[PDB]
Amino acid sequence: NIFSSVKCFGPIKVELPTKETVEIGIVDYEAGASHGNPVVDFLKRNGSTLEQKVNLENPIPIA
Amino acid sequence: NGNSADAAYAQVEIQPRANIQLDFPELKPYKQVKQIAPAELEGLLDLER
Amino acid sequence: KGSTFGINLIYVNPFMLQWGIPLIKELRSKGYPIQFLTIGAGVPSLEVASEYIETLGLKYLGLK
Amino acid sequence: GFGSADDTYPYLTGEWSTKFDYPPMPFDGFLFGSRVMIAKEVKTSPDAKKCIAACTGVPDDKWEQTYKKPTGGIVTVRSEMGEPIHKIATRGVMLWKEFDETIFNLPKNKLVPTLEAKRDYIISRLNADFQKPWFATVNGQARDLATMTYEEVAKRLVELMFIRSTNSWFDVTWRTFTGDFLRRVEERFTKS
Amino acid sequence: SAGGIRRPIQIEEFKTAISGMSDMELAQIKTEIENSINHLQRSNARLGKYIAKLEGAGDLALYKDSVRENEIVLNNYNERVDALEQETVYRKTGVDMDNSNVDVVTPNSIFI
Amino acid sequence: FEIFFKKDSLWQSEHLEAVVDQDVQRTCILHGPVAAQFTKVIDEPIKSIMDGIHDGHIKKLLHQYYGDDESKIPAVEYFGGESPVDSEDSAVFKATSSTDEESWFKALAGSEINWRHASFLCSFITQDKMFVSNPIRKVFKPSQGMVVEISNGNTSSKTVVTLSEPVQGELKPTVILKLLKENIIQME
Ligand SMILES: Cc1cc2nc3c(=O)[nH]c(=O)nc-3n(C[C@H](O)[C@H](O)[C@H](O)COP(=O)(O)O)c2cc1C
């Protein structure tokens, strides 16, 4: 259950007026004996993914 | 820190129970009792009465 | 490596039977080297002993 | 009642049953409990092994004497259920045997009256002889638990449950028992 | 069932065991112990006759400690039915015009 | 009182440190009247005791029934695993849908008690300390088409048992159960 070492890292990009992206930051989280990755736990709640599944009201039997 | 350094952080409390006392009068040491009364009083009263 | 041993369970102690029979069945299904089970202090009923004989993968049952 | 080849050989060969005018009747193997209690690598404390080696014992003709009196250094005493147990006749067990013949064979309505009467006797004997002493003695003086101070209790729980030689609580559950008691003292005597 | 085996069993270990059972397994033990009790009372009845017949006038002190002994066992069985009774019952349970509040004499008490 | 007095009476004799005065005479020690008259020598190694009794039985049994002669004692490869209920050199067996499992494994094992006898009738084997079901009986459990061939059946050291099945129509070798070096059973 306990992690020896956690490491989250990657570019932070901003959408420009033109809709091209640019690097303006880096994620650099490092930890020793942790129970979690806080960076991803943050972005899940306070952010969103690019795509979102939305369920039909009623599942439709195809076959 | 899951619930390891956010769960062992919390102490144990003592809620008091009622220790009802009979309130017998506090008896002082003899040397402090002889201040209060005058020295002539020793052997002067008939305690039977 | 290869050795075995057994287990005595007092029949007149319903609590040790309640945790201990399941414990053998479990350890015997993981292949622990428990060759046999002696039930002391009593002899079980046919319907019980039948469950010890079939269900715990034992070589033999001791009865006193 | 086996210890050597010599006494256990007649049962291997079947010839034991000849003595009783039956035909030979041989056995497929033997078990040795009592025999093996003084072996190098059991946990029986050295003093207890000396105590076992001292028991002379008695042949099969006489063993039932044990229901009456120490026979080869050994008596029977009843369990809490009334099952016999064969125990070495230590002071402890002789006291157990006395209380089976006197207190525990009484009907329930005579039991409590008899304990009040024999109280000072029973406590002398628990403290002198038995493995479980009378809890409420401070400096060898037999009290009751209602005539003991909260300190006298704490100090006595440590005396009986904490081992000075090994510097540890004999069982963790005993440490939880004394710790729970100290937490009661705080609950009872705190104002706030 | 190892609870109810027509032989005296230590009550602390019975009470603990009885905790961990199903309600239909408890109901089975209870039926079995009740039957054991009836067998011991019909045994103590027969013993009551051979006493009353012989007390009409050795081998009477023997009829007496045969019924003393059955009461030791019988005390264990109804001590066991009492623990069952206790376990059963455990499973059931688990205007103001004085300016005391707002001071309206003061410009800021209203909501400045 | 009777419970408090008698409750938990049997550990104390093993742990005198936790008894008042470290005094045995306070304590319950369990022991038999009759058996007590052989318990004399303190701290005898358990092997010394149990061998004593066993080597005693042999010494005697030898005298009565083998005229004090070890040469008359039947020799077997390994002693054990016999439920208390019950010669050809180049054979060939043929499993059907009828062939009884118990009959089939008697045959492969053969008469002599050796590695082959163990291999097919040992119900269990040991991985490290654990007891797993015998994989060699799993493999040779009989079904339509499988054909066992034994060779040097009457000299264990070179015996080879060679299972063959249907493989893409024809019949090819699928197992080769034999000895390597002296004490190793290879199941190629
Ligand atoms: C210290 C001691 C403890 C025993 N504990 C048990 C036990 O827990 N369960 C049991 O069925 N028998 C127990 N027995 C009985 C033995 O299993 C066996 O019946 C007996 O020791 C053999 O008799 P012997 O002692 O005369 O050689 C015990 C015997 C002794 C001496």
CB-CB under 8 Å, D80 with E76: no
Number of C-beta neighbours around residue D127 at 10 A: 14
Compute the distance between CA of residue D26 and CA of residue D10 in angstroms, rounded to an integer. Answer: 8
State the structure-solving technique.
cryo-EM
CB-based contact, C10 to chain E, within 8 Å = no
| Nearest CB to E9; choose among C14, C18, C44 | C14
Asked whether F72 and F108 are in contact (CB, 8 A), the reply is no
3-state secondary structure of A31: strand
Task: Give the contacts of F20 (CB within 8 A, at least 6 positions apart).
Answer: D133, D160, F26
Which ligand 1 atom is at minimum distance from the Cα of C38?
Answer: 11
| Resolution of this deposited model, Å | 2.8
Instruction: Count the residues in chain D.
Output: 192
Compute the distance between CA of residue D107 and CA of residue D116 in angstroms, rounded to an integer. Answer: 15
Asked whether D139 and D122 are in contact (CB, 8 A), the reply is no
Cβ contacts (< 8 Å) between C58 and chain F: which residues?
A: none
Q: Best residue in E65, E71, E72 to probe D by mutation, most D CBs within 10 Å?
A: E72
CB-based contact, B38 to chain D, within 8 Å = no
Number of C-beta neighbours around residue C35 at 10 A: 13
Cβ contacts (< 8 Å) between B7 and chain A: which residues?
A: none
State the angle between helix axes of D91-102 and D108-128 in degrees (0 to 180), rounded to the nearest 10: 160
CB-based contact, D82 to chain E, within 8 Å = yes
Asked whether D24 and D18 are in contact (CB, 8 A), the reply is yes
Q: Determine whether F131 is exposed, middle or buried from the number of CB atoms within 10 Å of its CB (0-12, 13-18, 19+).
A: buried
Asked whether A6 and A37 are in contact (CB, 8 A), the reply is yes
CA angle, corner C60, sides to C58 and C62, nearest 5? 120
Task: Give the contacts of C60 (CB within 8 A, at least 6 positions apart).
Answer: C35, C36
Compute the distance between CA of residue D142 and CA of residue D157 in angstroms, rounded to an integer. Answer: 15
Q: Where are the beta strands (DSSP E) in chain D?
A: 74-78, 84-88, 137-138, 141-142, 162-163, 168-169
3-state secondary structure of F93: strand
CB-based contact, D109 to chain E, within 8 Å = no
D–F interface: beta-carbon pairs under 8 A? 197
**Segment holding F186, helix H or strand E:** strand F185-187
Compute the distance between CA of residue A63 and CA of residue A19 in angstroms, rounded to an integer. Answer: 42
- Can you name the residues that pair with E75 across neighbouring β-strands? none
- Strand C5-10: give its sheet, edge to edge: C5-10, C34-40, C60-63
Residues of C within an 8 Å Cβ radius of F: 1-2, 30-33
Neighbouring chains of E at 3+ CB pairs under 8 Å are C, D
Compute the distance between CA of residue C18 and CA of residue C61 in angstroms, rounded to an integer. Answer: 18
Number of C-beta neighbours around residue C26 at 10 A: 11
For residues F91-113, one letter each, b for 16 or more C-beta atoms within 10 angstroms of the residue's C-beta and e for the rest, the string is eebebeeeeeeeebbeebbbeeb
User: Which DSSP category does F151 fall into?
Assistant: E
Neighbouring chains of A at 3+ CB pairs under 8 Å are B
The number of angstroms, rounded, from the C-alpha of B37 to the middle of its chain's C-alpha atoms is: 24
- Residue type present at position C58: L
Where are the alpha helices (H) located in D14-107, listed in sequence order? 46-54, 91-102
Residues with CB under 6 A from ligand 1: C 8, 10, 40-41, 64; D 1-2, 31-35; F 30-32, 35
User: B43's torsion region: left (phi>0), alpha (psi -120 to 50) or beta?
Assistant: left
Residues 69-108 of D with CB under 8 A from F: 71-74, 79-80, 85-88, 90-93, 96, 99, 103-104
End-to-end CA distance of chain A: 42
User: F12's torsion region: left (phi>0), alpha (psi -120 to 50) or beta?
Assistant: alpha
Please choose, from the candidates F40, F142, F160, F145, the residue with its C-alpha nearest in 3D space to the C-alpha of residue D57: F40
